[PDB]
């Protein structure tokens, strides 16, 4: 069934699984037309498909050309997500194929199940968690590749950089969600926190700065303060 706080360590066992997040697949800017009406202009998007155990991220860039002359884009986007995920699964060797696919929004279940009918043994699942994967376009290097793409493109990353050399996949996952939650609640504050110190750089092959263990604790504390704070600013507490 669904994924919640009670079966949380399941993410980090040795059954291959992926999260799929479709929030950034279909993206628009809304603007006024010359006649004073409103129109949308689509911008590139991405499927965020993540192995929470390894940190491997299969970033499928969604080029705006895939919407040309299509109707009901918010619906097509879910079916385009499913199709790209199903294509990805098929491209992988059998022993690399996921045993489960967890969707961050329940509207993906049916598009994905239908596309994966060939894989009856892959469980398609929802989750009760409020995961901040939408903030993934707040990671500069990820937003850059999306916005620069001129054609469909798959780009592979490790979203944990070299973290697993020192910490477990549970801790690495918890660090990522804390980072992404903070970016979602106050991006400027979040980014200012991550980069205020010029001496800590982001390596060319990495997404996040090269913090020491001690530095990550400070950073992690500051993101928690930021998230509690904005919750007061928002709710007045």
């Amino acid at each position: 069934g669904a994924m919640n706080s009670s079966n949380y360590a399941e993410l980090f066992n040795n059954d291959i699984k992926l999260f799929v997040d479709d929030t950034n697949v279909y993206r628009v800017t809304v603007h006024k037309t010359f006649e004073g009406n409103v129109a949308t202009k689509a911008i590139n998007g991405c499927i965020f498909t993540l192995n929470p155990k390894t940190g491997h991220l299969f970033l499928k860039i969604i080029h705006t050309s895939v919407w040309a002359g299509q109707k009901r884009l918010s619906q097509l986007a879910k079916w385009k997500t499913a199709e790209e995920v199903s294509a990805l699964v098929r491209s992988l060797p059998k022993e690399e194929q996921p045993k489960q696919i967890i969707v961050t929004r329940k509207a993906m279940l049916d598009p994905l199940e239908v596309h994966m009918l060939d894989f009856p043994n892959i469980a398609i699942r929802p989750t009760e968690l409020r995961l901040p994967f939408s903030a993934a376009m707040s990671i500069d290097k990820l937003s850059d590749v999306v916005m620069k793409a001129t054609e469909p493109q798959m780009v592979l990353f490790n979203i944990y950089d070299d973290w697993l050399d020192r910490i477990s996949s549970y801790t690495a996952f918890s660090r990522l969600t804390l980072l992404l939650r903070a970016l979602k609640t106050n991006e400027e504050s979040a980014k200012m926190i991550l980069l205020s110190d010029p001496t800590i750089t982001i390596k060319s092959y990495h997404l996040w700065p090269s913090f020491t263990d001690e530095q990550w604790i400070t950073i992690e504390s500051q993101m928690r303060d930021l998230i509690l704070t904005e919750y007061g600013r928002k709710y007045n507490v």
Binding site: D110, E113, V114, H115, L117
Partner: protein, 300 residues
């Protein structure tokens, strides 16, 4: 007009014949049913006074043989049987009618209800859903499971309805995943009508037999089958005008006949609200939508 005589009635029971029913008291001098209209299938069904658990009954067609009912005190039920001795049968029936211990099938002459509920139902197809080929009538009861229910346990005592599954490779062409799942026309017209049923009359006839099994014996599997066949049509953008018009008649009479008190369990809220108010065919079932809104506005 034909006759299903009864050897006797040793146990108190409510007897149904098509949409009609009547009480028989323990060892009352009851010897069967007369004036049954030829040309239709029929169902004769039973609910014991002592144990309302298990409605059960027989589908039959008097053109196909001489059938009678006899209680079996070992197996505890009223059993349909065939008499091959036509002479002996006429002999027995004439005596019981001369002594007037038979109820008369009570057909009002303005009433086309049974016809409209069984228009497409054919005994030959019933016998393919209910497999028991040594008899020309077919037994059904409340607890019989369908071939798909056992897929999701005794295959001999199953209802072999045509499996319909919207999230199956049969229903979904590679490369039209979105298209075929949101508009089931391919699955309706090519897979089911042309492929499996051959024509719309066979489809409708299974549709009607599912509904009757569902209402007369509280057979969940039948209810599921009836709703799926409706939903497949309603969810197909491309349906022959003549199937839509007939569907609206079929469902109308089904809705009309349903016991008002059984509506909450025999009508699936999601399917009807979708079919009547969201589907491609939401505008196409005028009679069916008018009776559903005037009789069961709660469900919607």
């Amino acid at each position: 007009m034909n006759t299903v005589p009864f050897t006797s009635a040793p146990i108190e029971v409510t007897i149904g014949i098509d949409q009609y029913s009547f009480n028989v008291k323990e060892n009352q001098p009851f010897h069967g049913i007369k004036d049954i209209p030829i040309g239709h299938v029929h169902v004769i069904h039973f609910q014991h006074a002592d144990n309302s658990s298990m409605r059960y009954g027989y589908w039959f067609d008097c053109r196909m043989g001489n059938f009678y009912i006899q209680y079996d005190p070992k197996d505890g039920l009223y059993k349909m049987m065939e008499e091959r001795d036509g002479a002996k049968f006429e002999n027995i029936v004439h005596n019981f009618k001369e002594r007037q211990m038979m109820v008369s099938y009570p057909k009002i002459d303005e009433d086309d209800t049974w016809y409209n509920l069984t228009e497409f139902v054919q005994m030959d197809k019933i016998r393919k859903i209910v497999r028991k080929d040594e008899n020309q009538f077919s037994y059904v009861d409340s607890s019989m499971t369908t071939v798909q229910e056992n897929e999701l346990s005794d295959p001999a005592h199953s209802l072999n309805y045509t499996v319909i599954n919207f999230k199956s490779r049969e229903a979904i062409r590679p490369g039209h995943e979105m298209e075929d799942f949101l508009d089931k026309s391919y699955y309706l017209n090519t897979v089911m009508l042309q492929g499996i049923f051959k024509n719309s009359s066979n489809y409708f006839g299974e549709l009607q037999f599912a509904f009757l099994n569902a209402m007369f014996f509280g057979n969940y599997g039948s209810s599921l089958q009836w709703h799926a066949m409706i939903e497949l049509i309603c969810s197909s953008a491309t349906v022959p005008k003549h199937m839509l018009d007939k569907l609206d008649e079929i469902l109308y009479y089904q809705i009309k006949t349903l016991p008002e008190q059984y509506s909450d369990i025999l009508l699936n809220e999601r399917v009807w609200n979708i079919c009547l108010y969201s589907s491609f065919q939401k505008n196409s079932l005028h009679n069916t939508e008018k009776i559903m809104e005037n009789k069961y506005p709660e469900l919607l």
